Amino acid sequence: ATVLLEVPFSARGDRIPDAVAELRTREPIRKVRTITGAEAWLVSSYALCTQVLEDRRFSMKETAAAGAPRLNALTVPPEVVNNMGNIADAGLRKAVMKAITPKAPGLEQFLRDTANSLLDNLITEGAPADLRNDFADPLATALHCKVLGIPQEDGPKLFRSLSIAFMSSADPIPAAKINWDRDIEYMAGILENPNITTGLMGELSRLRKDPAYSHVSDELFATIGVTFFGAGVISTGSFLTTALISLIQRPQLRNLLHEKPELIPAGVEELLRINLSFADGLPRLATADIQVGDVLVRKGELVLVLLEGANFDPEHFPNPGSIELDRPNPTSHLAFGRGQHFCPGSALGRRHAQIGIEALLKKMPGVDLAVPIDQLVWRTRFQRRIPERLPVLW
Ligand code: HEM
Ligand SMILES: COc1ccc(C[C@@H]2NC(=O)[C@H](Cc3ccc(O)cc3)NC2=O)cc1
């Protein structure tokens, strides 16, 4: 006898398990057990993944309900699971989204300057260099301090909350609450700090004193800062880190992008499509009985949308494991989600990765792993797949 199939399948972000294609072919919606012991429906085809993400009756907010089957334990207050809904209800969606585009004057130049400086320091120190801890993550952290309008020197401590905040744990995490409360206090102080006049926090600080927003809670204003820093930094840093592995392991593509950097956006779009950064399916709770393929999902059941199930589906992306810069549907992947909860930072995430890769290929055209790929240490029980260190030479 065997137990019910358990998720996640593997924390390795450098290869997709053969099991994904087998599940997609035979049972594209199938029952699994999560790390909490709850049962859930794992959805692994493009068609069914899009169906779930485009049907709001599969609710993100309701995953936080007491007594629901859980993918993992909450690391934020339950109301924060509805973060974007709360922002929209407060009338703040347009302002938040405008503050996090890559189009602000000097922002892309700041990204280039920061990437080039980080790479120069690695070259000066000499190989081996750690492209996660000393390139991709500091670049993400610096970018988000700039976007938020907060001091660069405050970034590292905020960043160090993230190895706990984005855990995917069976049980509540005491350190997550300690860091959350402290980071909220920091952002509340930022709102009261007269020097904070630019970026997202500068804009929220002004809106907070605008009579049209007098009803919006100070709790929400501080939460926007903590959540956008955390989600943005963990997502951009982890994506860039694993995209760099994908690129390093494809010297032909690395050389092509080095020779023709105008192909970098199309390359990054494929790197997004094949990216394994999300360690768990996206969770949703059914609020009605809904037919998904061969399964009638019942009200109150947990559904997990496996992004790499959709993104490696050969019925949507022929030869799905291959990076093709001339696909007819290149942005139709689900790396940024789909539907109501589509990532509001997608343009900034694209630009972070494009500029980081452009700078790396210019400064380190001979970049290669400095250890055998199997020697990378993949973080476990985390909401992202990332190597703890990414040792390279050039
Ligand atoms: C390459 C980088 C990124 C990737 C791959 C990514 C991925 C995703 C995905 C898949 C979702 C959908 C989650 C779901 O439906 O359950 C999402 C939502 C979200 N992302 Fe991103 N993200 C990235 C960058 C960013 C950045 C830079 C920010 C902010 C500065 C950000 C903030 C958010 C927020 C707040 C949500 C929730 C939106 C909602 O619930 O409506 N992300 N992201
Ligand atoms: C791209 O990753 C996500 C992850 C989760 C959600 C759902 C919902 N929306 C959010 O805005 C924050 C994100 C967050 C921030 C900080 C933190 O310590 C933990 C999580 N929490 C949520 O639960 C959305 C996107």
Reply yes or no: is the peptide bond before residue 8 cis, omega within 30 of 0.
Answer: yes
For the Cβ of 102 lying below 6 angstroms from any atom of ligand 1, the answer is no
The domain 1-394 is placed in CATH, from the list 1.25.40.10, 3.40.50.300, 1.10.630.10, 1.20.58.390, at 1.10.630.10
Structure tokens at 21: 């294609």
| HSE, side-chain direction, 13 A CA sphere, residue 98 | 8
For residue 236, report the distance from its CA to the centre of ligand 1, in Å.
9
Closest CA to 202 of 111, 109, 104: 104
**Residue 117 near residue 135 (C-beta atoms within 8 A):** no
With 0-12 / 13-18 / 19 or more C-beta atoms within 10 angstroms meaning exposed / middle / buried, residue 340 is middle
Ligand that comes closest to the CA of residue 56: 1
Look up tokens 């109150």; give the residue.
300
Please list the alpha-helical segments (H only) found in the chain.
18-26, 46-53, 83-89, 93-99, 107-125, 137-148, 155-160, 162-165, 174-192, 199-208, 218-248, 251-259, 264-273, 307-311, 346-363
Task: Tell me which residue has its CA closest to atom 3 in ligand 1.
Answer: 235
CA angle centred on 160, ends 135 and 145, rounded to 5°: 65
Work out whether strand 302-305 and strand 39-43 pair parallel, antiparallel, or are unpaired: parallel
**Residue 43 near residue 29 (C-beta atoms within 8 A):** yes
What is the C-alpha to C-alpha distance for residues 162 and 381, in angstroms, rounded to an integer? 13
**Residue 308 near residue 333 (C-beta atoms within 8 A):** no
Sign of CA dihedral 31, 39, 66, 10: negative
Residues forming beta bridges with residue 391, ordered by sequence position: 130
Angle separating helix axes 346-363 and 218-248, nearest 10 degrees: 40
SS3 77: coil
Q: Is 363 left (phi over 0), alpha (psi -120 to 50) or beta?
A: alpha
Sheet holding 129-130, edge to edge: 129-130, 391-393, 368-369
**Residue 241 near residue 132 (C-beta atoms within 8 A):** yes
Got the DSSP string for 299-366? TT-EEEE-HHHHHT-TTTSSSTTS--TT-SSTT-SSTT--GGG--TTHHHHHHHHHHHHHHHHHH-TT
Structure tokens at 371: 């250890």
In the annotated binding site, the residues are 75, 83-84, 235, 284, 299, 341, 343, 383
Closest CA to 226 of 262, 176, 264, 281: 176
Cα 380 from chain centroid (whole Å): 16
For the Cβ of 75 lying below 6 angstroms from any atom of ligand 2, the answer is yes
What is the C-alpha to C-alpha distance for residues 136 and 356, in angstroms, rounded to an integer? 8
Angle separating helix axes 199-208 and 174-192, nearest 10 degrees: 70
Closest CA to 274 of 251, 250, 303: 250
For residue 365, report the distance from its CA to the centre of ligand 1, in Å.
30
Specify the amino acid at residue 261: P
Closest CA to 17 of 249, 287, 303, 308: 308
Specify the amino acid at residue 256: L
What is the C-alpha to C-alpha distance for residues 164 and 342, in angstroms, rounded to an integer? 24
SS3 284: strand
The structure was resolved to a resolution in Å of 1.4
Angle separating helix axes 346-363 and 107-125, nearest 10 degrees: 40
Mutate to test the pocket of ligand 1, among 59, 144, 311, 336 (most ligand atoms within 8 A of CB): 336
For residue 344, report the distance from its CA to the centre of ligand 1, in Å.
6
For residue 169, report the distance from its CA to the centre of ligand 2, in Å.
15
H-run or E-run covering 297: strand 295-297
Atom of ligand 1 nearest to the CA of 60: 16
Atom of ligand 1 nearest to the CA of 283: 16
Residues forming beta bridges with residue 368, ordered by sequence position: 393
For the Cβ of 63 lying below 6 angstroms from any atom of ligand 2, the answer is no
Backbone dihedral angles phi then psi of residue 43, each to the nearest 5 degrees? -110, 125
Angle separating helix axes 107-125 and 137-148, nearest 10 degrees: 150
What is the C-alpha to C-alpha distance for residues 279 and 379, in angstroms, rounded to an integer? 10
Structure tokens at 283: 């969770």
DSSP structure class, residue 285: E
For the Cβ of 235 lying below 6 angstroms from any atom of ligand 1, the answer is yes
In the annotated binding site for heme, the residues are 284, 341, 343
What is the C-alpha to C-alpha distance for residues 125 and 338, in angstroms, rounded to an integer? 42
For the Cβ of 165 lying below 6 angstroms from any atom of ligand 2, the answer is yes
Task: Tell me which residue has its CA closest to atom 11 in ligand 2.
Answer: 83
**Residue 352 near residue 114 (C-beta atoms within 8 A):** no
DSSP structure class, residue 72: S
What is the C-alpha to C-alpha distance for residues 31 and 75, in angstroms, rounded to an integer? 25
For the Cβ of 230 lying below 6 angstroms from any atom of ligand 2, the answer is yes
Residues contacting 216, CB < 8 A, separation 6+: 90, 91, 92, 207, 208
CA angle centred on 44, ends 41 and 49, rounded to 5°: 85
Backbone dihedral angles phi then psi of residue 337, each to the nearest 5 degrees? 80, -160
Structure tokens at 190: 């930022």
Specify the amino acid at residue 378: W
Atom of ligand 2 nearest to the CA of 235: 1
What is the C-alpha to C-alpha distance for residues 367 and 363, in angstroms, rounded to an integer? 9
Ligand that comes closest to the CA of residue 303: 1
SS3 384: strand
Work out whether strand 29-33 and strand 282-286 pair parallel, antiparallel, or are unpaired: unpaired
